[PDB]
């Protein structure tokens, strides 16, 4: 049903579809909609039930953890598809060193269109309606990866080590940690960001 491509690989046409779809995603008020979809990851915590006693929905530090997030991505992908996205959500290959933050996400304004209208880039960010706060990202330049090999970045090393593990459990432990890095990188100190458990789901980078 769907193919996933790298962000860099995405063509303008492909990205354009994504650009619009997210915009429409944002619009979707419904539960399927983005605002609702985000809450699945964390705050507000609906997880045990709507009841006051609540915990974060996502499973972390648990072997279930990769399962949950994997499922989570599909939810978005389906949402975009409904929205009319031509392609599966792209993944931002963190492992490779990043000369600069990907253009699709980075550009605050999505100028290109036949219309040549200027608009905000839904990809760039979103806001949290409950908090009525806005997403923010504090990123470290260090992310631009430098390494002796050059190829073997910390992420690459960490990911690879996890890769060599028959034990799933062992794999997950290593697997999750590598995953953690990006949240820290983008979020930075910002309370409302990827760095935060509850807030992080809001940023669109999350899906990528």
Partner 1 sequence: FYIHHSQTDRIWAIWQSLQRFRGLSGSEANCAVNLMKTPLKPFSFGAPYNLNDHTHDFSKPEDTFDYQK
Partner 2 sequence: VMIRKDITQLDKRQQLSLVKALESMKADHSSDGFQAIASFHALPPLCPSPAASKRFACCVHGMATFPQWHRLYTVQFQDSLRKHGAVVGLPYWDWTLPRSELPELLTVSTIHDPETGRDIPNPFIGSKIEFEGENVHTK
Partner 3 sequence: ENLVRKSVEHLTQEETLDLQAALRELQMDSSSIGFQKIAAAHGAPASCVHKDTSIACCIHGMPTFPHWHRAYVVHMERALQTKRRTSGLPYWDWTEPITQLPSLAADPVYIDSQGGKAHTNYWYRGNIDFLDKKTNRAVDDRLFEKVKPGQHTHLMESVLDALEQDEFCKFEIQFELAHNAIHYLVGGKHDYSMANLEYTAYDPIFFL
Judged by the rule CB under 6 A, the positions of this chain that interact with ligand CUO are 41, 58, 60, 69, 179, 183, 200
Q: Are 159 and 95 in contact (CB under 8 A)?
A: yes
51 is in an annotated binding site: no
Of residues 73-132, those binding partner 3 (CB under 8 A): 108-109, 111, 116, 118, 120
> What are phi and psi for residue 14, nearest 5 degrees?
-60, -45
166 is in an annotated binding site: no
The binder of 41, among partner 2, ligand CUO, partner 1, none, by C-beta within 5 to 8 A per type, is ligand CUO
Residues in binding contact with partner 2, number by CB under 8 A: 18
Site string for partner 1, 92-131 (x = CB under 8 A): --------------------xxxxx---------------
> What are phi and psi for residue 127, nearest 5 degrees?
-130, 160
CA dist., res. 14 & res. 20, Å (int):
10
Q: In the complex with partner 3, which residue's Cβ is closer, 112 or 176?
A: 112
| Helix 168-187 with 154-163: angle, nearest 10 deg | 160
Q: In the complex with partner 2, which residue's Cβ is closer, 57 or 80?
A: 80
CA dist., res. 12 & res. 153, Å (int):
29
CA dist., res. 51 & res. 99, Å (int):
46
Of residues 97-156, those binding partner 2 (CB under 8 A): 113-115
In this structure, the number of other CB atoms found within 10 A of the CB of residue 71 comes to 11
Which residues sit in the known binding site? 41, 60, 69, 179, 183
Residues that bind partner 3 (CB under 8 A): 108-109, 111, 116, 118, 120, 133-136, 138, 189-192
């Amino acid at each position: 049903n769907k193919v996933r491509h790298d962000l860099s690989t995405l063509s303008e046409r492909d990205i354009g579809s994504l650009k619009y779809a997210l915009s429409s995603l944002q619009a979707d008020t419904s539960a399927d909609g983005f605002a609702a979809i985000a809450s699945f990851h964390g705050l507000p915590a609906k997880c045990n039930d709507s009841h006051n006693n609540e915990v974060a929905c996502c499973i972390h530090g648990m072997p279930t953890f990769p399962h949950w997030h994997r499922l989570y991505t599909l939810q978005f992908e389906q949402a975009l598809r409904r929205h009319g996205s031509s392609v599966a959500v792209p993944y931002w290959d963190w492992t490779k060193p990043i000369h600069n933050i990907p253009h699709l996400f980075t550009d605050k304004e999505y100028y290109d269109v036949w219309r040549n209208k200027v608009m905000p880039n839904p990809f760039a960010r979103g806001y949290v309606p409950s908090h009525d706060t806005y997403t923010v990202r504090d990123v470290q330049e260090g992310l631009f990866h430098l390494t002796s090999t050059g190829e073997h970045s910390a992420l690459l090393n960490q990911a690879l080590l996890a890769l060599e593990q028959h034990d799933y459990c062992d794999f997950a432990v290593q697997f999750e940690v590598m995953h953690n890095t990006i949240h820290y990188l983008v979020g930075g100190p910002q309370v409302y960001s990827l760095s935060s458990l509850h807030y992080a789901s809001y940023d669109p980078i999350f899906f990528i």
